[PDB]
Design an enzyme around this catalytic site. Structure first.
Site, PDB file in Angstrom:
ATOM      1  N   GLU A  76       0.788  -1.201   0.012  1.00  0.00           N
ATOM      2  CA  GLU A  76      -0.098  -0.087  -0.083  1.00  0.00           C
ATOM      3  C   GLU A  76       0.945   1.273   0.109  1.00  0.00           C
ATOM      4  OE1 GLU A  76      -2.639  -0.793  -0.678  1.00  0.00           O
ATOM      5  OE2 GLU A  76      -3.081  -2.566   0.264  1.00  0.00           O
ATOM      6  N   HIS A  89       1.584   2.166  -3.748  1.00  0.00           N
ATOM      7  CA  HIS A  89       0.654   3.004  -4.378  1.00  0.00           C
ATOM      8  C   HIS A  89       0.897   4.311  -3.776  1.00  0.00           C
ATOM      9  CE1 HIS A  89      -1.604  -0.269  -5.886  1.00  0.00           C
ATOM     10  NE2 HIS A  89      -2.097  -0.713  -4.707  1.00  0.00           N
TER      11      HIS A  89
HETATM   12  C1  097 Z   1      -5.064 -13.362  -0.337  1.00  0.00           C
HETATM   13  N1  097 Z   1      -5.630 -12.008  -0.904  1.00  0.00           N
HETATM   14  C2  097 Z   1      -5.429 -11.146  -1.838  1.00  0.00           C
HETATM   15  O1  097 Z   1      -4.240 -11.297  -2.342  1.00  0.00           O
HETATM   16  C3  097 Z   1      -6.071 -10.135  -2.214  1.00  0.00           C
HETATM   17  N2  097 Z   1      -5.443  -9.097  -2.553  1.00  0.00           N
HETATM   18  C4  097 Z   1      -5.313  -7.656  -1.793  1.00  0.00           C
HETATM   19  O2  097 Z   1      -6.173  -7.625  -0.889  1.00  0.00           O
HETATM   20  C5  097 Z   1      -4.747  -6.758  -2.340  1.00  0.00           C
HETATM   21  C6  097 Z   1      -3.261  -6.212  -1.362  1.00  0.00           C
HETATM   22  C7  097 Z   1      -2.503  -7.433  -1.291  1.00  0.00           C
HETATM   23  C8  097 Z   1      -1.478  -7.076  -0.015  1.00  0.00           C
HETATM   24  C9  097 Z   1      -1.627  -7.542  -2.676  1.00  0.00           C
HETATM   25  C10 097 Z   1      -5.556  -5.458  -2.368  1.00  0.00           C
HETATM   26  O3  097 Z   1      -6.731  -5.669  -3.050  1.00  0.00           O
HETATM   27  C11 097 Z   1      -4.889  -4.018  -3.054  1.00  0.00           C
HETATM   28  O4  097 Z   1      -4.583  -3.874  -4.042  1.00  0.00           O
HETATM   29  N3  097 Z   1      -4.575  -3.151  -2.280  1.00  0.00           N
HETATM   30  O5  097 Z   1      -3.932  -1.750  -2.444  1.00  0.00           O
HETATM   31  C12 097 Z   1      -7.234 -10.425  -3.292  1.00  0.00           C
HETATM   32  C13 097 Z   1      -6.704 -10.445  -4.497  1.00  0.00           C
HETATM   33  C14 097 Z   1      -7.876 -11.798  -2.868  1.00  0.00           C
HETATM   34  C15 097 Z   1      -8.461  -9.236  -3.260  1.00  0.00           C
HETATM   35 ZN    ZN Z   2      -2.891  -2.720  -4.651  1.00  0.00          ZN
END
Ligand code: 097
Ligand code: ZN
Ligand code: MG
Ligand code: MG
Ligand code: NA
Ligand code: NA
Ligand code: NA
Ligand code: NI
Ligand code: NI
Ligand code: NI
Ligand code: NI
Ligand code: NI
Ligand code: NI
Ligand code: NI
Length: 284
Positions: free
Chosen positions: A147, A150
């Site tokens: 995060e 980003h």
């Molecule tokens: C096991 N789950 C995951 O990997 C989830 N990913 C996230 O939660 C991301 C963050 C991770 C730290 C990569 C989030 O959506 C994001 O882009 N924040 O900026 C899914 C894809 C299931 C939604």
């Molecule tokens: Zn992300």
């Protein structure tokens, strides 16, 4: 030339209740891990995550409204933190970025699989330099790092713009096996570079005054397997079965989120976990 990301760490009532007196050490442990990721040569820049401020919200009214809605929780948070920042960076407690940790399960516009959220390219805008992190245990240290990516204007590594330059890096949109020798993709390296070259991190030039000391030990030195299971699955969980996947109790039912044991975690006498392998503490 060195970038110091002056940070405020904030943790809600759910965090205060869950962690009790150990909360501040927990936050700093999470952040020590992220700070380490940002020192990796693959990021192609000198970036120092430092803490100048921690706020714990023992009293819900003194914080932002935290809810299951990730982007509102983040909007609630980014607004609320404004009041808590001095206006000059000259003030020792002035922060370039704020990060909220909650035990609340965050949800996107589809699923509650969401582990965190941030706005893109915000690092030196006090009204928008913000991210929110679901504490699902020590994996939150990677969520934090992702995060903050980003916030430094890195997009996801599967975005059209990252095609020429480049799921094994920090800004993969979904967790997979991280390439421990090169955690930052070529796209991430270029996109943070451009951002700073374009002069968008001018607030990151000044050094921190009396920053809060980060733990130098590996996180598994602080937190054994049973403790890590507790962070992810609640206080009644403990370790089941090494180093590659942490399984936790829940007849004998065991469960996992497919995360590794933290680096430093004991896996036998004289051994501990590093990059998901049980290696000797004394290296030959
Ligand atoms: C096991 N789950 C995951 O990997 C989830 N990913 C996230 O939660 C991301 C963050 C991770 C730290 C990569 C989030 O959506 C994001 O882009 N924040 O900026 C899914 C894809 C299931 C939604
Ligand atoms: Zn992300
Ligand atoms: Mg204040
Ligand atoms: Mg049994
Ligand atoms: Na979630
Ligand atoms: Na969930
Ligand atoms: Na990227
Ligand atoms: Ni409420
Ligand atoms: Ni790669
Ligand atoms: Ni209890
Ligand atoms: Ni109990
Ligand atoms: Ni064990
Ligand atoms: Ni599963
Ligand atoms: Ni790994």
């Amino acid at each position: 030339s060195h970038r110091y990301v002056e940070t405020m760490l904030v943790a809600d009532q759910s965090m205060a209740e869950f962690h009790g007196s150990g909360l501040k050490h927990y936050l700093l442990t999470l952040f020590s891990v992220a700070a380490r990721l940002y020192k990796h040569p693959s990021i192609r820049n000198s970036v120092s995550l430092v803490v100048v401020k921690i706020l714990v919200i023992h009293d819900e009214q003194k914080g932002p409204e935290v809810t299951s809605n990730a982007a509102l929780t983040l909007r609630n948070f980014c607004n609320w933190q404004k009041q808590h920042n001095p206006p000059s960076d000259r003030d020792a407690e002035h922060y370039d970025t704020a990060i909220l940790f909650t035990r609340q399960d965050l949800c996107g516009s589809q699923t509650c699989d969401t582990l965190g959220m941030a706005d893109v390219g915000t690092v030196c805008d006090p009204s928008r330099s913000c991210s929110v992190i679901e504490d699902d245990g020590l994996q939150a240290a990677f969520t934090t790092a992702h995060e903050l990516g980003h916030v430094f204007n890195m997009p996801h590594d599967d975005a059209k713009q990252c095609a020429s330059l480049n799921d094994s890096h920090m800004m993969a949109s979904m967790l997979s096996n991280l390439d421990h020798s090169q955690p930052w993709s070529p796209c991430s390296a270029y996109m943070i570079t451009s951002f700073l070259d374009n002069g968008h991190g001018e607030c990151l030039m000044d050094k921190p005054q009396n920053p809060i000391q980060l733990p130098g030990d590996l996180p598994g030195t602080s937190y054994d397997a049973n403790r890590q299971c507790q962070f992810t699955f609640g206080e009644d969980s403990k370790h089941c079965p090494t180093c590659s996947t942490l399984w936790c109790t829940g007849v004998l039912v065991c469960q996992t989120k497919h995360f590794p044991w933290a680096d430093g975690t004991s896996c036998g006498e004289g051994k501990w976990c590093i990059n998901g392998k049980c290696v000797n503490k004394l290296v030959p």
